[PDB]
Design a protein around this ligand. Structure first.
Ligand SMILES: N=C(N)NCCC[C@H](NC(=O)[C@H](CCCCN)NC(=O)[C@@H]1C=CCN1C(=O)Cc1cccc2ccccc12)C(N)=O
Ligand SMILES: Nc1ncnc2c1ncn2[C@@H]1O[C@H](CSCC[C@H](N)C(=O)O)[C@@H](O)[C@H]1O
Length: 221
């Protein structure tokens, strides 16, 4: 709330920025398209702990990719582990491109949704895993909290919400170029608890370039 002065401009500027980004992996990853394989291999081990290690295993039937872009995570992380996948993104051109990028396994993407997370209500009791990566900084603290609570009602039994995103070492940093905020661990943990979710696991991503923000993965339900 504190670093976002005008909510309408905050969302409007962010939409303008992504409409001017090429629909490629490098566009999704802000010039770091080459770290994608490290990210995916890391995300896979983090997720497989919940799909393969009991007692309360997570299902493998349906997953929701939030901020999916052209489907970078959907192609290499979700589709090989889940029978079905839904995608949601605010940038229409990215969802158009996804149908080419996904290739033959994209036939198992059942629903494409073009709208912001602040407007999206995932269907209740419908998903095993809701994957939210590098998009939470584009939401206000209130909208993130209400979206996550709406995600809680959308989970199947033993389902989890996974947030993987940039985390500041301390405090909150506004990015006035792409109109996004970077939060520290404590601020995000307050938003998660405000959504009524419990923390199951956290993990700091390793093998990333020195200059970039720290990346953490949260498993919630
Ligand atoms: N040469 C130098 N020394 N430069 C000075 C140091 C620069 C360094 N830059 C970073 O750490 C950037 C932060 C981008 C700013 C808004 N995040 N982190 C990555 O690009 C990271 C790597 C792959 C995807 N990644 C995402 O962040 C996902 C992502 C990509 C594009 C736009 C996004 C908008 C919102 C959220 C995520 C976004 C810094 N400490 O600022
Ligand atoms: N408010 C919002 N709601 C939903 N999606 C948003 C959004 N603001 C930006 N986005 C989308 O989120 C993506 C962030 S960068 C792409 C990250 C992607 N999850 C990946 O790991 O490959 C962009 O494609 C952008 O179109």
């Amino acid at each position: 709330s504190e670093v976002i002065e005008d909510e309408k401009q905050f969302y409007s500027k962010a939409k303008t920025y992504w409409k001017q980004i090429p629909p490629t992996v490098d566009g999704m990853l802000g010039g770091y398209g080459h770290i994608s394989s490290i990210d995916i291999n890391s995300s896979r081990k983090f997720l497989q702990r919940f799909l393969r290690e009991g007692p309360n295993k997570t299902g493998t039937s349906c997953a929701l990719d939030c901020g999916a872009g052209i489907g970078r995570i959907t192609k290499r992380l979700l589709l090989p582990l889940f029978r079905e996948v839904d995608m949601v993104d605010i940038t229409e051109d990215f969802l158009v491109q996804a149908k080419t990028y996904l290739g033959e396994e994209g036939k198992r993407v059942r629903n494409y949704f073009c709208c912001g997370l602040q407007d999206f209500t995932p269907e209740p009791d419908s998903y095993d895993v809701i994957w939210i990566q590098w998009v939470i900084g584009h939401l206000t603290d209130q909208h993130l909290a209400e979206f996550l609570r709406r995600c809680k009602g959308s989970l199947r039994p033993n389902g989890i919400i996974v947030i993987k995103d940039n985390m500041a070492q301390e405090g909150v940093i506004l990015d006035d170029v792409d109109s996004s905020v970077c939060r520290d661990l404590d601020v995000v943990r307050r938003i998660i608890c405000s959504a009524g979710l419990s923390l199951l696991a956290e993990e700091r991503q390793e093998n990333l370039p020195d200059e970039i923000y720290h990346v953490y993965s949260f498993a919630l339900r």
